[PDB]
Design a protein around this ligand. Structure first.
Ligand SMILES: Nc1nc2c(ncn2[C@@H]2O[C@H](COP(=O)(O)OP(=O)(O)OP(=O)(O)O)[C@@H](O)[C@H]2O)c(=O)[nH]1
Ligand SMILES: [Mg+2]
Ligand SMILES: [Zn+2]
Ligand SMILES: [Zn+2]
Lengths: 230, 77, 50, 79, 119, 149, 87, 352, 249, 189, 228
């Protein structure tokens, strides 16, 4: 046993979305070992917040068109799937959006809750063309993980069945893209050591450092079964 | 088949004088499907006592279908 | 997005799909380069040149 | 027996007769509730019949023997 | 072998074959086994080759013949001959929806054949 | 022209790239052709293609199950399909598909009851189509009678 | 039900009459109003048997209570409707 | 209502219950085969690759029919007579119909086939397990020439197997495939670079020595390892893979002057139209052979750039060629219209 | 749009007529999902009329193959437009070019036999992005006929139906607009007059026990085909002249 | 249709004597492959007639087939379906091995259907003639049969017979290669 | 987070060398995630002891043949690569082997050191045919991890390499073979779950179960960098 632990060295946040994380020193071959095993967890298991439910007044179904609005209701739903939201305290929040006049409705027009951060305020939701047109809607954001479509959700719950509530495919998973590059790290004696450079691209919020901590946690939690129980 | 056989099982689970007038009326065991008044030709020879005994056989059998797990379950079909 | 079987090409003699794939990649390469220059916001002059 | 029937076929010989013999035995366990020789190990009557034939416990002739044995003892009881 | 099923008898036997009748070689050889034992007038014959289509129509079974092809003609020929099919082939048993006389069915079908032989 | 366009993309002349197995993280032994193919989802869906039936409606004269998934149809087991069972020697499976599965009206109900009672006993009879054939032949003025045993 | 062999021979006029359970003398199929078979028609229930199980046409005899009964009124035997494919 | 408990019951019933799969058209008895069903969420039937041969089933939108053997007799008919494991050999010729195709052959070809030195030429390995360890560890290619020590099991006069340990010169790849090989078969069968033609003889040999059970498991193993290595190989279809003859334009201009000579001999009224037709067709038929032969020598043995000592020749590792040579896919006539010349086409008449 | 095209894509899309094209060049006065108003330029604009073209766009309608035909507006509010330009895209067209499917990142290589004979191995990412997802508009009809026994009713009042089921039907017996439905849910309630049927002696006995006499009104209700599931986007009612109209109609 | 294995052994001595197909230069169908799993008739031994090699009623196993090649058997009487004496079917012996099983056919199996399917399927599924000159490849003595040639002005053996065959005889005296020499062909020797 | 942990289900020890370990349930994708990451540690990183250096007297190079010996020197070296040795105290030990006469030389003929255990004493090393033949050699065993070939050692260490010192490929890693197969596991609701079947083949001393425990340990030891 020549046990040797890595330490988190550099967190280069080129952007809130894109971040590089260098990691050293890693013993020879552990670069790819951890690199890949982490990449798999990072793409799937990572939890986040996403739009589950939408309710626009004067809208019975997603296939209709609202007058004074360029986008069809489905187009608007697609935009909300891609809305970046961070919820600090609660797991479920309902944000309200009332906007009027000749304006491209952005994410900033939503009444922000005390503990609710809209990460991309300029994010487009809807285009109001007629000045007399006013749009009013209630966007329900829940916290979860992976991809939970509206087809899996219309075949389980359904105790309350309100006509005029639009269910939306939840894209909870924050990790958009991840790649890990393994370069050689040089110690005075050990030149076979390696550094692991993990390039992450996530939607809004989920912090690069925080995500890595959670990903390593889930791996160690699974390893409990192979350590503790034999 | 299952329906017709089911009743028979619980038809011999009632009284001896409750399944000797109820079946001899519907024509289940007997030869001819009689009416309330026609059951008098056998041995009953009554009109009101035949109607009381018919429905008494039916009421004890309704509780035999409620306990085995039918009643409202077998109501839809 | 998709993994297709190459064993369905030499027998089929439909090499159009391969050329489409190479050119499609080249088209997407140019797209990724314009995408990179728009993310940086270099300027009208430089985008025009490329 | 389950995957490969070759050793079972090599006991009786005729594939067609193997099917008839294992079907008649499986009918016994299916309807009579006749007890299995081999541990079922949670397998269907069909599989048990074929295992029994592979090991050489069931046979057209042996089935016919136990048929007359039990039928004749019942005739003895009647008279 | 199926093409060489039939044979034309040129010269009378001890049965009612006589000149020019065309019968299955199996049946005339079985006749010749009984002639060998009994002597009597032996049957002289010649094996004939038949094309697949005609060979299938030459089978004694009119159910088989009619099911194949030429159905209107087959049934007029059978109806006028007063033909009786005792059902030995697979086709015929499949049509009445019965057990095949082959494979798994050979066991049961021979058990029937001995039930038939003993009454 | 395409290779020159690839070079403006800083992509390789081969159009083959180094790819890594998502599972293992190790590279594939050699370059793989990677790019964008414009693809189509055809009208043929699996929701319109998948079909299943145990028991359902039966045809008017022939008494065999109907055809087509919209009418809840049985798959046709055709002459060619029959011959395959004949080759194999599988006599009961064949008879089954001729009788209890198809026309035999007594057989199918009796068989159903046996299946629910666990006992997979075969209780076959005569296909109703054959009865019809005979009647159709007699309507033609040809006497076709059954000589019993 | 289980037979040994099958014979085909010429149908005698007299043989054809053996199978027949009545002479059809009208082109009439059913009545336009009561979709019920017309007398001595191609669908005559008086010849080919009852439309409904153990039911005469005019409805005088119903259920197994009247088994082999021939309704005097309509002239229909009370039996299984199965016979309409047989007779 | 599709209640939770109903799925557990369904699971109970289908176990040990064979089901018939059928594909149109049913040309021979193997067009119907029985399998033990495995319940899957998702609406498509999953078919075993090795029996795709019997069905002629390619998944370009093919559909199949499912039939339930109901009676105990029908179930036993399915399990004994119609089970896929029980019906391997064609009834037409005494040959196994269940034979790897496509990806499977390509993978095994890739493993067995040798390269010059590469990673770890002339190493010495204790078992095929050390070889597997070396390959996946990344200190040996599958094509590395190596003096490994494998212990083969040869059958004696009786039923007893005589084992024999020896050092042969095989690749790392061949050592690893030996692990799939049952005890009883010789090592020399896998020691060659394996193609579809050799793998069928492998299955035949296995059937005649070991019998049914071993062949069935062996066939499955071969399928798994075949796909597995096919995917590892990262083989693909480039535009650089289609090599044409450096001497095409010469052969064609020559053949074209030749055809012009016979056209001129026609214009002189000596050679008949029919004689010229036949001689023009003969000139082009020979031109086609020569160009194809040129492509195939240029492609087959194009790897004339080796190392160790000086310049060495070996079989080309061109993906397209490998595919044809293994018999995975493509042929010598398929490569003709992929790099050489298309050739002469014959009309709907039959005439060229 | 297809990255690797030929050029015919534009001509096919425009010439097919499924795309709304501009009759006359000018500036767009009013964009909407439902319609497009363009104000014509003075040079093309006739001296008679106001000279404002209004194109009403055809929205989510059924195709013959039960696919979805929708016209999306592809102009911005107040944009200068040339005559014969694409104002709105048909179902399979992108900015006037033909878009029949979707290009994506493909690699040619064997993979554990999941691409065996042309079999295709696709990333969950494509499913998630819902890009290959498709719309099918299906049309279910409920016919109230006049029979020998009497007229059929379109009431919500049906023998043996749970309040769960009748929740989605209005007073008339027709499902509400926007309501999500799955196999076996009733879309339109319909009930049919039952004549005489000889009740088997056991049913005579059984109905004597329970007492619930076989209601004369039977059940011919149009329900969601087994295994199809979707959202009601529209309802149409055809009545003859003189039958009492449903509350829903 | 009707043809089924009815009997085990018809007890017939009959069969058909088969030979190796040597069409061209590569042996298209060997005798071993043409008589594999075929009930041999009479007693077929080795070339030198002075000792028996194979038994009368014996299935042709790969073993006995290998021995046939070492002994160089020219031609062998093999039991055939056509020569079967079984009435209303054929015996397991006259047929031989069920090719699909790899052993002797089971009585009761429906052979005819299998045969017709086997012949038909390939046809149904399947739905450079510059033969200027024959080149002999191994050394041998030229052996013509069914040939009537005549010498010409040039000095060349020209053949004036339609079905002329050309054999290639080895050292001991057995047929290795075989060709079809057509009418009006010019022979070198 | 609804953290779904697997639980160790079946430990089928077919042999002390070969063992199968099934594992369920694993959340979707974690079968390959753990499967591979473990396999890598198990092969290249598991520590043990192996023959590094050999010196037979009267042997200048590995390609020569010694008289009275069936095996070529290479064959003998191959056998030493597969020699199972446990060293308790020291990291480097030199064992001496002197044997003569008509005997299959086994591992037991080596003079065992106080703290040196030969795990397979019957392990074949050499076959002496001539009775007058005597073989004398010094086998240097070092402790290490993974696979260190002599080709990767000559290019790195160019210090002392005198003639006669036979270098042999070092196999410190005790894991002889490992494969992990991922099959689908069924829960009443979750059918996307998978089971991980890890087939291990290990040599002497190190137990299959023990090795797996140590493998997960080494991974968790480097998982402390990001705290949790
Ligand atoms: N019965 C029937 N089968 C068809 C028809 N059209 C195509 N097929 C089948 O679908 C398949 C299409 O050709 P392929 O199967 O690709 O040909 P292949 O045998 O794979 O040969 P290669 O293409 O050289 O690999 C064939 O096997 C055909 O049998 C048809 O009209 N009727
Ligand atoms: Mg296909
Ligand atoms: Zn009446
Ligand atoms: Zn014979």
């Amino acid at each position: 046993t020549e046990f040797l632990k890595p330490r988190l060295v550099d967190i280069e946040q080129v952007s809130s979305t894109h971040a590089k994380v260098t990691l050293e020193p890693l013993e020879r071959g552990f670069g790819h070992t951890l690199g890949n095993a982490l990449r798999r967890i990072l793409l799937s298991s990572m939890p986040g917040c996403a739009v589950t439910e939408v309710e626009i007044d004067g809208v019975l179904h997603e296939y209709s068109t609202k007058e004074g609005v360029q986008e069809d209701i489905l187009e608007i739903l697609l935009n909300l799937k891609g809305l970046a939201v961070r919820v600090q305290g609660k797991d479920e929040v309902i944000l309200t959006l009332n906007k009027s006049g000749i304006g491209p409705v952005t994410a900033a027009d939503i009444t922000h809750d005390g503990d609710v951060e809209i990460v991309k305020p300029q994010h487009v939701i809807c285009h109001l063309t007629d000045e007399n047109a006013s749009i009013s809607m209630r966007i329900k954001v829940q916290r979860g993980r992976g991809y939970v479509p509206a087809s899996t959700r219309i075949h389980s719950e359904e105790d309350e069945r309100p006509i005029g509530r639009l269910l939306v495919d939840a894209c909870y998973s924050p990790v958009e893209r991840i790649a890990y590059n393994v370069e050689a790290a040089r110690v005075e004696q050990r030149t076979d050591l390696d550094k692991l450079v993990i390039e992450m691209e996530t939607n809004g919020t989920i912090d690069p450092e925080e995500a890595i901590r959670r990903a390593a946690t889930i791996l160690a939690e699974q390893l409990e079964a192979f350590v503790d129980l034999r | 088949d299952d329906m017709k056989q089911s009743i028979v099982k619980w038809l011999f689970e009632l009284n001896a004088k409750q399944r000797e007038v109820l079946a001899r009326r519907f024509g289940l065991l007997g030869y001819e499907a009689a009416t309330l008044e026609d059951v008098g030709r056998e041995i009953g020879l009554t009109r009101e006592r035949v109607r009381q005994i018919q429905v008494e056989g039916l009421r004890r059998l309704r509780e035999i279908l409620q306990t085995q797990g039918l009643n409202i379950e077998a109501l839809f079909l | 997005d998709i993994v297709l079987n190459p064993l369905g090409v030499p027998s089929r003699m439909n090499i159009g799909q391969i050329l489409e794939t190479h050119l499609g990649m080249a088209a997407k390469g140019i797209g990724d380069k314009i995408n990179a220059m728009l993310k940086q916001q270099q300027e009208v002059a430089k985008l025009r040149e490329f | 027996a389950r995957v490969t029937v070759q050793d079972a076929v090599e006991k009786i010989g005729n594939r067609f007769d193997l099917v008839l013999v294992a079907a008649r035995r499986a009918r016994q366990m299916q309807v009579g509730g006749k007890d299995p020789l081999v541990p079922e190990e949670n397998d269907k009557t069909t599989v048990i019949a074929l295992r029994e034939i592979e090991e050489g416990l069931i046979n057209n002739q042996i089935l016919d023997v136990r048929e007359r044995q039990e039928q004749q003892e019942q005739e003895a009881a009647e008279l | 072998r199926q093409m060489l099923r039939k044979a034309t008898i040129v010269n009378a036997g001890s049965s009612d074959f006589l000149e020019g009748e065309q019968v299955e070689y199996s049946r005339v050889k079985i006749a010749n086994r009984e002639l060998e034992a009994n002597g009597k007038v032996g049957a002289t014959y010649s094996r004939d080759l038949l094309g697949i289509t005609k060979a299938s129509l030459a089978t004694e079974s009119f159910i088989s013949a009619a099911s194949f092809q030429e159905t209107t003609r087959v049934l007029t020929e059978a109806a006028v001959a007063g033909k009786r099919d005792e059902l030995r082939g697979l086709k015929e048993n499949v049509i009445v929806g019965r057990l095949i006389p082959a494979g798994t069915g050979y066991a049961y079908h021979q058990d029937r054949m001995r039930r038939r032989a003993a009454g | 022209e395409i290779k020159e366009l690839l070079k403006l993309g800083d992509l390789p002349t081969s159009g083959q790239i180094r790819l890594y197995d998502g599972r293992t993280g190790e590279q594939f032994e050699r370059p793989v052709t990677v790019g964008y193919m414009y693809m189509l989802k055809l009208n043929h869906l699996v929701d319109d293609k998948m079909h299943a039936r145990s028991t359902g409606s039966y045809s008017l004269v022939t008494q065999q199950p109907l055809g087509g998934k919209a009418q809840f149809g049985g798959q046709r087991f055709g002459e060619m399909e029959v011959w395959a069972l004949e080759a194999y020697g599988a006599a009961y499976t064949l008879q089954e598909m001729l009788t209890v599965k198809s026309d035999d009206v007594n057989g199918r109900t009796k068989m159903y009851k046996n299946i629910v009672d666990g006992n997979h006993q075969m209780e076959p009879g005569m296909p109703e189509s054959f009865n019809v054939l005979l009647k159709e032949i007699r309507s033609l003025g040809i006497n076709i009678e059954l000589e019993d045993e | 039900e289980e037979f040994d062999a099958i014979k085909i021979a010429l149908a005698s006029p007299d043989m054809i009459r053996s199978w027949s359970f009545g002479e059809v003398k009208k082109p009439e199929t059913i009545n336009y109003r009561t979709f019920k078979p017309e007398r001595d028609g191609l669908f005559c229930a008086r010849i080919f048997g009852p439309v409904k199980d153990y039911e005469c046409l005019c409805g005088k005899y119903k259920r197994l209570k009247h088994r082999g009964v021939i309704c005097e009124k309509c002239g229909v035997e009370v039996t299984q409707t199965k016979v309409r494919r047989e007779r | 209502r599709e209640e939770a408990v109903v799925w557990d019951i369904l699971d109970e019933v289908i176990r040990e219950h064979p089901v018939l799969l059928n594909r149109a058209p049913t040309l021979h008895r193997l067009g119907i085969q029985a399998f033990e069903p495995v319940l899957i969420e998702g609406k498509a039937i999953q078919l075993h690759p090795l029996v795709c041969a019997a069905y002629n089933a390619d998944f370009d939108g093919d559909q199949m029919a499912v039939h339930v053997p109901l009676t105990l007799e029908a179930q036993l008919e399915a399990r004994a007579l119609m089970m896929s494991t029980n019906n391997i050999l064609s009834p037409a010729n005494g040959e196994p119909i269940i034979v790897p195709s496509q990806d499977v052959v390509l993978g095994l070809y890739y493993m067995t086939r040798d390269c010059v030195n590469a990673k770890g030429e002339g190493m010495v390995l204790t078992g095929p397990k050390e070889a597997e360890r070396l390959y996946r560890s990344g200190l040996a290619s599958l094509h590395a020439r190596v003096k490994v020590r494998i212990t083969e099991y040869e059958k004696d006069a009786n039923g007893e197997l005589v084992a024999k340990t020896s050092l042969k010169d095989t690749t790392v790849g061949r050592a690893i495939l030996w692990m799939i090989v049952p005890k009883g078969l010789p090592y020399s069968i896998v020691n060659q670079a394996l193609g579809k033609k050799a793998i069928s003889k492998m299955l035949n040999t296995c059937y005649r020595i070991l019998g049914l059970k071993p062949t069935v498991i062996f066939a499955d193993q071969i399928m798994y390892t075949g796909f597995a290595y096919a995917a590892r190989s990262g083989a693909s279809v480039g535009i650089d893979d289609m090599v044409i003859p450096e001497k095409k334009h010469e052969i064609i201009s020559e053949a074209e002057a030749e055809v012009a000579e016979i056209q001129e001999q026609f214009q002189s009224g000596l050679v008949t139209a029919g004689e010229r037709y036949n001689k023009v067709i003969d000139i082009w038929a020979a031109a086609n052979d020569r160009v194809s032969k040129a492509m195939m020598d240029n492609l087959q043995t194009e790897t004339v750039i080796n190392r160790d000592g000086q310049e060495e020749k070996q079989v080309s590792f061109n993906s397209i060629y490998m595919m044809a040579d293994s018999g995975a896919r493509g042929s010598a006539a398929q490569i003709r219209q992929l790099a050489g010349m298309r050739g002469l086409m014959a009309k709907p008449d039959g005439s060229i | 749009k297809p990255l690797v095209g030929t050029g015919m894509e534009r001509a096919v899309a425009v010439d097919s007529g499924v795309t709304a094209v501009a009759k006359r060049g000018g500036v767009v006065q009013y964009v909407d999902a439902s319609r497009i108003v363009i104000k014509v330029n003075e040079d093309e604009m006739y001296p008679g009329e106001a000279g404002i073209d209004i194109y009403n766009l055809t929205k989510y309608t059924r195709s013959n193959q039960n696919t979805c035909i929708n016209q999306m507006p592809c102009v911005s509010l107040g944009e200068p437009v040339e005559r014969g330009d694409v104002l709105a895209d048909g179902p399979s067209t992108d900015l006037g070019e033909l878009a029949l499917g979707q290009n994506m990142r493909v690699a040619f290589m064997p993979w554990n036999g999941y691409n065996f004979e042309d079999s295709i191995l696709v990333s969950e990412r494509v499913v998630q992005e819902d890009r290959f997802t498709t719309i099918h508009i299906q049309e279910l009809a409920c016919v109230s006929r006049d029979t020998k026994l009497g007229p059929e009713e379109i009431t919500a009042d049906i023998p043996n139906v749970g309040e769960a089921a009748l929740s989605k039907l209005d007073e008339s017996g027709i499902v509400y607009i926007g309501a999500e439905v799955t196999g076996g849910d009733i879309l339109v309630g319909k009930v049919t007059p039952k004549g005489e049927t000889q009740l088997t002696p056991e049913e005579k006995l059984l109905r004597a026990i329970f007492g619930e006499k076989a209601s004369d009104v039977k059940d011919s209700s149009l329900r969601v085909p087994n295994g199809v599931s979707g959202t009601v986007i529209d309802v149409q009612v055809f009545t003859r002249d003189g039958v009492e109209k449903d509350k829903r109609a | 249709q009707d043809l089924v294995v009815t009997e085990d052994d018809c007890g017939t001595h009959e069969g058909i004597m088969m030979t190796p197909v040597i069409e061209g230069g590569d042996v298209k169908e060997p005798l071993r492959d043409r008589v594999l799993g075929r009930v041999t008739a009479e007693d077929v031994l080795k070339p030198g007639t002075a000792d028996i090699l194979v038994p009368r009623n014996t299935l042709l196993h790969e073993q006995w087939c290998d021995l046939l090649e070492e002994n160089s058997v020219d031609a062998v009487k093999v039991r055939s379906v056509v020569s079967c004496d079984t009435d209303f079917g054929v015996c397991a012996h006259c047929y031989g091995r069920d090719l699909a099983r790899g052993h002797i056919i089971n009585k009761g199996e429906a052979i005819g259907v299998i045969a017709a399917q086997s012949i038909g399927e390939p046809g149904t599924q399947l739905t450079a003639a510059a033969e200027s000159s024959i080149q002999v490849k191994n050394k041998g003595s030229i052996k013509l049969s069914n040939v009537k040639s005549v010498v010409n002005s040039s000095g060349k053996l020209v053949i004036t017979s339609r079905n002329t065959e050309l054999k290639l005889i080895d050292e001991f005296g057995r047929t290795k290669e075989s060709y079809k020499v057509p009418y009006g062909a010019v022979l070198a020797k």
